[PDB]
Design a protein around this nucleic acid. Sequence first.
RNA 1: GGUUGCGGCCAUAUCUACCAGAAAGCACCGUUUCCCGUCCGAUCAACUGUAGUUAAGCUGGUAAGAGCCUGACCGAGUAGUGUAGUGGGUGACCAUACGCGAAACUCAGGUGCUGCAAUCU
RNA 2: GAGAACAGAAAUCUCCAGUAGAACAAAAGGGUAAAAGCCCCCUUGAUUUUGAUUUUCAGUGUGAAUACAAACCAUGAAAGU
RNA 3: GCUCGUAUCAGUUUUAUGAGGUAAAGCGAAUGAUUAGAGGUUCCGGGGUCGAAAUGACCUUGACCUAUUCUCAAACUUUAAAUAUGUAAGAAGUCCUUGUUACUUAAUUGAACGUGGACAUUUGAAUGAAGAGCUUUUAGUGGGCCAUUUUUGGUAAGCAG
Lengths: 169, 159, 58, 294, 218
Amino acid sequence: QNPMRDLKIEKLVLNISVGESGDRLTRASKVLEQLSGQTPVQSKARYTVRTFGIRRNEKIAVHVTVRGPKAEEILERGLKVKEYQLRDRNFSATGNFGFGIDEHIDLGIKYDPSIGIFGMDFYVVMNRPGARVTRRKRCKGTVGNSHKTTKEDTVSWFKQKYDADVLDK
Amino acid sequence: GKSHGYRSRTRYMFQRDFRKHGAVHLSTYLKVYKVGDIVDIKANGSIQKGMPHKFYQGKTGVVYNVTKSSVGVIINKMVGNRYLEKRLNLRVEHIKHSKCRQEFLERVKANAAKRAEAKAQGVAVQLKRQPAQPRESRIVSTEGNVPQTLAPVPYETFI
Amino acid sequence: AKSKNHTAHNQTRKAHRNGIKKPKTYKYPSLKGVDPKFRRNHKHALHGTAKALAAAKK
Amino acid sequence: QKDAKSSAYSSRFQTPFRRRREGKTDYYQRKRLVTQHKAKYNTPKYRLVVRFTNKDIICQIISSTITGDVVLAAAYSHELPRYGITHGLTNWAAAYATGLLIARRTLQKLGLDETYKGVEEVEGEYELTEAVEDGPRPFKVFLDIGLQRTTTGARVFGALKGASDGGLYVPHSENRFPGWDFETEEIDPELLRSYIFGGHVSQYMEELADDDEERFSELFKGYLADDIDADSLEDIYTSAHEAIRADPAFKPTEKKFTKEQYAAESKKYRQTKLSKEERAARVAAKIAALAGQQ
Amino acid sequence: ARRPARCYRYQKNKPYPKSRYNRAVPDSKIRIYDLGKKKATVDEFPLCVHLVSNELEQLSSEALEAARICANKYMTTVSGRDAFHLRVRVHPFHVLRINKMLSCAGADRLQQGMRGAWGKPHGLAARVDIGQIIFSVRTKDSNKDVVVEGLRRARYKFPGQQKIILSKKWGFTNLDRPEYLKKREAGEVKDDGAFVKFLSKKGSLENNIREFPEYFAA
RNA sequence: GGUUGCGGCCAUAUCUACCAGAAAGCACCGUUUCCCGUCCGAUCAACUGUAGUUAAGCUGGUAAGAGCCUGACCGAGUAGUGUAGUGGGUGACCAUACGCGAAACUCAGGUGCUGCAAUCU
RNA sequence: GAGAACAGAAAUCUCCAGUAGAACAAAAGGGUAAAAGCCCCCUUGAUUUUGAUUUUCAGUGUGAAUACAAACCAUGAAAGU
RNA sequence: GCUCGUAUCAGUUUUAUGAGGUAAAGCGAAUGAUUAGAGGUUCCGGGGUCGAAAUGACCUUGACCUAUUCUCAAACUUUAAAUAUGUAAGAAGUCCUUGUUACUUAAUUGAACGUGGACAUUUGAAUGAAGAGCUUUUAGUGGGCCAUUUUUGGUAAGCAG
């Protein structure tokens, strides 16, 4: 019996991690806003490391989280670029997944010479109705193992929708 | 050189407890204290305001004053060859009712009831307490209790 | 020329010579250090009860 | 070693309080809500607890004792159909109505009903319960929100407003009320009054009727069935206010059954624990079958 | 050029381990504590003989190493390297101190005497009790006299009085010979690498049947 | 007896992995004009109660379960210790006398009790 | 721990565990989880008057601190602080 | 000397009730040390093979796991004594339409202090009490040393603490 424990898309996070801040970060924010219909947020560094050439609180990345039909549309637009060949490596043990793309023009964005070529990372968070139990304020809980999203059922859901395919490796 | 601070050598004294850390339960706040109440002092290491000194930790005193969030305690402290009266302003988290006085009040009521029964009948109620008396004569039988003879055991290494 | 630093030797004997008798306890302890709002109240209430007792049995 | 909860971990684990584990109560706020001035020796400290489940509002007046909290008088939203509020039992206006009901009930219980009549002609204006010459002070209660989020235009403050216009002196500020503008520190009694009487629902009714009829059929179906309109829900809210003030006596239900019958049926249905002898028997059966290979 | 052991024989100070406060102490002289066939199964070496201390004192790391080397060499030379298992059951953790300065005649001019006499670490010792095991050898019963002879040889390297007692236990286990034998004829014991595991009457039956197959698979 | 709000004691209450839950309640759930906060109506805010429940939460059962709790006249009167001797011993230490007296391979049992208000084939 | 595209054991990291193994100016010890930690909004109680009290103590001083009174304020929806 | 005259006492026990973190114990309990022994994808120290190529293949420390007790801690601890230690065992005490108040309460509800009432030959454990409460004033002293015991530094000392 599966009344409402069916998989559903919680959120899609589009993340572009620039090397630095400034014009490049502004360009990435502009492209993310144009793609997602909403402003993104800039992620500063968690710590500094001289060997990696970054400073603490330097606005390294930019990211946006979308939900619902917009998340579905962006997911299929990125899967068009990927040509629907993912992997069990690409899928996670918690049921979520994601994939990285380059040359965001393939998503359908009109090229502008200023913006240039920015890559990005989609990460889709799979779930089913009831995550409010673990995300609400009063009476916090944890879902049961029956209700937990997993590798097998998330790959089954992904390869059932759009009948996509996954590699053994 | 030498250190004698306010919380000197209180490392284990104010240590909270094992698996009793954190927020304190609300009965300590709901308890009320009146002037003349007898209170035990045991500092809560978690609450740092109105904390008693390590000398008064474990001391029993009498309430002389009551304020918004605390209480005044009278403690007799031995200074040299006499006792001096010390007045503390301790919080209810460090204060707790003493049960010796409660037991004595219960005994007072029990003596009142026994005296009322004596006024009723006159059967030598004998209010005063007595120490453990020597045991009276008794007879011990051996039905299914025949004495079992014991002997000192020989030495063995056992290791 | 070093000397003895500290000792509590003989101190308890000295204290117990004429020593450690308890402090003298009183009915009506001092109200010093007691809440002054309460003390204002107590002044007014004691005034009132003395007046009532005088009126009842002059 | 991801799922590594060792015996030492479980042994040194200190569980929170039961209500903290259940995520029901905030003890940091509860301590300040229930801790009394020690020179106010035993005088109870009363909290107007307001809780918002789905399709129900619970409003209680509780004081705290050692053995547990003690309820003075409680008003639930599910008894508002008795006064004439059948639809929208959780909305802002229902919260105001049930707060008014609990205020009236508590005043009647304490004998403070004729005095401190409250506010009968409400306007959405912020007012305090004035001191009465040579008369008992108003019953004082402090709002208890628990884990609910204090924010502008919340039904917890709706129930607070209900109680304050009921007559309970519940200390509050007007800046969490709907109609408050952050830019100008001035309340909007007109917008507050519309929220009091269901204007935020009547205007939604009108907008839905004039722009999307399918949503009007999908929701507001009960309103359609009982023929309530954007002019009439204000009427029913005023009528409910009047009935609440008229009779807050809290007549309860007949339960249709007997507590013993309830206990019998639920006990018969409920699962039962095994005895220790039969537990040992189950272990022995497992030993003889699974371990022994017959 | 080390101080005689008579200076550090007795347990005079509180335990003084190497810690965040010593943080500079010499290495222990003894680093090997198991010798012989240490991989042998519990059934293989049924007899246990203990070199026990009759005195509350301190055993130096130097003395422990010397006694271990002597007993190990004797066991090897008279019965072979795989006919026994020797275990040192005392680890030298107490750190001995010394106040040593530059050595010269007429040093009283700059010695400072007993001012600031706190010592620096210069040794390690094992703090043993009365009845505390110093050495334990497990072997076959045919090797009893050889093992007691080797422990007697090792005894000369220690200060104080030591006894040699043949344990009633089976090898290095906590069960005497008959109780171990009974638990072994039952399925209660399972041979781990060198030591043994016991089947508790408590626990999950699923794990008790995953492990210990023979006890239930009768 | 189930359930809810508010609790008291704060694991006998916690943690794992299964199973069950009638009715009511609780919850997930549906929506975005208005009060309201974020990239995100997913938290939080509001509106409706109409479209399904063991799917979760929740509750209760199951486990020679981990923990935790209470006892034991199998361990242990052991370790330690107050007091005593012109006791033993080179000493290290130990024994005796009059008293007090401690974890766990252990073993047994247990796995929330309850206060106030409200509702329930 | 399972994770993205350059990208790597140590950027960007979505979930799952997570009794604090982090952080709290500094030494160490105590203390702290819907906080005492990290963010955000407001702010000047680091204010006034004078007393009482604890520690060191001679129950002298100094230093530090504790609970009130009478004010004036900040913060919060409020209890409160 | 003063005020009194057997008690507003006690280097003691008992009963009741607190506080402690030392001795002991513990380390298949946290921290920190610490010895050994099965099986683990070499993208995850360093060493050879089917051969132009690596997940169809083995051994060497153990990085990282498996709960197996070898041994420990003045500045480690769940537990936890003995001795020592706070308080109480009454007449200034225990129970009642009450009386006062500007404090407190929603409220004659509370808080404090009381008037009026019920408590006797046992007035609320033991033992003792060659009198109990001290008031003033002043001497000398302010190098100490030695036991059984607990103990720090030191190899130790008729050493130092």
